[PDB]
Symmetry: C3
Subunit: 410 residues, 3 copies
Amino acid sequence: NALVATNRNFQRASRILGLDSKLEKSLLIPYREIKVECTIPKDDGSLVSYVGFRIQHDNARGPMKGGIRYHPEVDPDEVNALAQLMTWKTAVVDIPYGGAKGGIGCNPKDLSISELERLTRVFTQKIHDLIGIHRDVPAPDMGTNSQTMAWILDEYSKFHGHSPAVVTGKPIDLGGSLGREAATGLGVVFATEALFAEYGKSISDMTFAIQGFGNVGTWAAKAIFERGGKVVAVSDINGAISNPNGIDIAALLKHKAGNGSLKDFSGGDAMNPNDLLVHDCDVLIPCALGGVLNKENANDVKAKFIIEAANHPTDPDADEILSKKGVIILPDVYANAGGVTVSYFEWVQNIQGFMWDEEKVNQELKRYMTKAFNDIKANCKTHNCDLRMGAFTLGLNRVARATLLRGWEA
Amino acid sequence: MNALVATNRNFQRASRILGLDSKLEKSLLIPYREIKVECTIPKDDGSLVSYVGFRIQHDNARGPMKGGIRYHPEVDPDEVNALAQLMTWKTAVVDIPYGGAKGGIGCNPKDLSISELERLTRVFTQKIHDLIGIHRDVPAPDMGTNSQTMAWILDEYSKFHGHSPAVVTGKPIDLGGSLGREAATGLGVVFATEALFAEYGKSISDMTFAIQGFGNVGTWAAKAIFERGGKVVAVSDINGAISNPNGIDIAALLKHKAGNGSLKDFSGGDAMNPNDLLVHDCDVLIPCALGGVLNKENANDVKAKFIIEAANHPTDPDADEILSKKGVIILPDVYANAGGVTVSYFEWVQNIQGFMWDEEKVNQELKRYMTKAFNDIKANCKTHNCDLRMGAFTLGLNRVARATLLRGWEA
Amino acid sequence: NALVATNRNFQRASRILGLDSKLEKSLLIPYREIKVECTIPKDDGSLVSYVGFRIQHDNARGPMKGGIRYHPEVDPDEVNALAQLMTWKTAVVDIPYGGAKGGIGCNPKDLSISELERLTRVFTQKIHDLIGIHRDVPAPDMGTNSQTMAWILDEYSKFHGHSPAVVTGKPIDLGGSLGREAATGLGVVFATEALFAEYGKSISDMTFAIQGFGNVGTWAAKAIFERGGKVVAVSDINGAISNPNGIDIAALLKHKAGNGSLKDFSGGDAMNPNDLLVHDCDVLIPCALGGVLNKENANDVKAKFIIEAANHPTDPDADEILSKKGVIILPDVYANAGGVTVSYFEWVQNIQGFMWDEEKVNQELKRYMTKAFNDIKANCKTHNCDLRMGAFTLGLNRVARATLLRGWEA
Ligand SMILES: [Ca+2]
Ligand SMILES: [Ca+2]
Ligand SMILES: [Ca+2]
Ligand code: NA
Ligand code: NA
């Protein structure tokens, strides 16, 4: 549902900035769209043919950036919207990139691992002249992973020499960054610390409920727990657990790790996962699916803060119902941006030919997230708007300023 | 345009102090490459105008060439060659890894609409993109150009060689420009003055100051002096001048100037003839706006014991000798105002590293480079038994000669 | 010499890791081997013709790296062995390079300084397309120096633009790094500090005997002395000096820069240089020749620690005898790796366009040597082997794992 959410947010932000109508149309037209044939021999010799693609939306603020999806469902308009969302998101946290999105229309469960490698190399052979370290830097996405990126790196480097910075999300052995897996969860916590400091409160003052215990949910709960937060309720798709004292997340992660369901963790009480969103607590954090907060449950939300860790968790309905209940909402486009920020740091480390240790990675993540919250809050004063429009006007205005500085003559 | 005559004198004096071989000297004088190119554009009404762009690339033994782009009608080649050469010594004095270049277009930018300036800048870039580059020659603003010009150079250059933020410096902050660029020259003057006064066991707070000029350099230098307990007793704008025997609240004066206040109106002092600032009774004199201001007449009448040359070439040769025989220590322009090119190097470094620095780090590095440079100059003065000006020119000249001789001469 | 040791170490390590024989065969085949004609006119105008060469062994972890030898004796077997050692060695200290080794079969004593410059520029003209800042980075070796690297830099840059990072060992004026002279000796001491910390001891608790007083011996002794170590015996080629309370290394370095032979030192008693290895100390540090620990003298060694600062000081019979006696041996491939680590830092500083101060160089040297020891020790625990196999399995496995991540499809 990124399509309708990004278009509404762009439109509302554009109207706040008063963007000139002809600049807006240019900003909406992608820099370049590419489709290429990817034919490979299967392991038995016979042929399969797919179409690979790359939408390169904008590069006014620097090289394009975004994921590669190996997925059968390819809608050109959703891909355009995701690339465009990367352009705004990078500008919100002031990393020097524009947005792109690409992939191949295939089902990776139909392909062996040798076939996946051959497909990835042929894709790279078909697009290498269109990507690059200062041109367009791919990353994992639905259906791809760090091993995919190793194959892209290896094949790209035959055409342009050894180029570690041409992709992010690489394995550690080949130039990947430390702290990549925790970065989104940890960034969520850094961002909430900045928000709470605006009221002179800190994380150790609050109770939290967390919906989803995936990559973001586990790391976000770890970071809250180590900073003195009381996590009082944790949900995932199966079961859920609560504890008004605060759940021992350290123990809960160990329990999940040894193949344990939440519902049978001894350090809490089993609860219905459908009751998580309306749990009694200070802060709610959706980390699972989007659109879970609508107008049927919005008035029932007990939290006074919503940290949008998942993408698009609250719809327009709830956004207003909660806004007049006094609930402050920290928007997805900013709050979960620790991922793209550390992927930038990976690219920096490769460019500088010298890796950072993990303390340095987390030190800069915190600097970037804190500085972005202050820029957002400053915009909310200038335009007297909520934090979601502070964020979008910030990124949109930064892309517009760079576009206008660069000019239009040939 | 004393830059021609002054750069030539100083090179000759320094070369003799070093005893440079005459064949090496000849090579050092010949620029690496001189380029002129046709730049023709359609005006807003479609009619054609034709200009000649140029780039003098003087020397690259110590690294990529570096220098400004001038949109100015006067384009004497001997002067453009001298400016490029001066940049080769200046980068060497502060030990940043560049050589010298200078370029421009023979045009008057007041004849050109803003769209015509852009087309002209883009065509100029089309004609020289193969001659500049991150590790080859890095242009910068100068008379008639600014950060907008640099953005256009960047935008057009990147069409030919890919996104290349480091190909120009002086970029807008939004396109990879560095923090602390604007204060860099004035702030650097103060760092250099602190290092000079440490040789006497004195400090900026021990002194009173007269500052000539309230432009980019004068304002920031006065602010840095004032925040270090220095007493600024006289400031000279182009329009007026202001006085105070006990110090001018530079902070309030900055507020007055910002709200469009003429210097002679600032209530926290009283007026002064600006044509008399150079002979104010002060410990330190800092010319900032204009050069050529100290000649055979005013020389014996100067009061200060120190002259910090923030402006370019403010001291005539005649005045250099007369002031020296009066015991006046002159911190030379080629070093004193080098903060600008030094921070332009840091901008290039930040672009190269793909990761910007905060302003604290920029200024820490600026202080380290200016301080090390003064220590190296002072050491040369001790080695060669010369004043600070020859200390600087021998340091820079020697560094370029050493790099040249290391690289060698076989094909 | 180096050939026999490297081959043995490789097989033992491969057997420990259980490397697949097909992978092993690939790992042993060099990526590329090059021979080029190098003809120049002599100062008198007549022609001499030489053969230049470059063995590029492996680049799965990054650009190849290694010395250029101007030497009449060209053994392709040992050239291959040295390039391959560089591949394992860089992996041991987690430096992002592979191994290469090159040279020109000539006697530099027959050539004037202008003829040497012409030979170096012509060699560069013949291999410029095969080397590069991210492809293969040469360095000094026997018969070449920093002036030689200056010529490679100047000629290479005519073809690919100003490229400071294409060679290391450059003059300081042309982008060379600080800290290079002390780097190997100081690295030896850093590595020895890390080992003793595992037993809860300090440098100040030990007595040391040091064989050899060249670049490595002088800096190693200087650094041991500063950290509180008692250097009770020092030998060179012409004699040796002893002092049970400790030799004043500072005063010994003064006497040596005054062209004073060791045995004429007033702050010690002259001993037989051939009794250094069996001198009564806690720690032996060979810094002169290889093979000086053989099956004859190995049983007489009284030190409980041997720090291999020289290349290949103990043959394998001595390894076995000293192990039974409880001697712990810090292996050469790790202990003396400070040289190649600082050369990496020179490349890093060039790539970043901004040089470091010597304090930062030595700070990073310490971080790298200390991390490598920790990685080595961890490996000794998994495979339950001595430190020497801990080091070779660590580096071998890093090259294997990078090779396997990159894959084999075209
Ligand atoms: Ca020349
Ligand atoms: Ca013509
Ligand atoms: Ca032939
Ligand atoms: Na028109
Ligand atoms: Na001759």
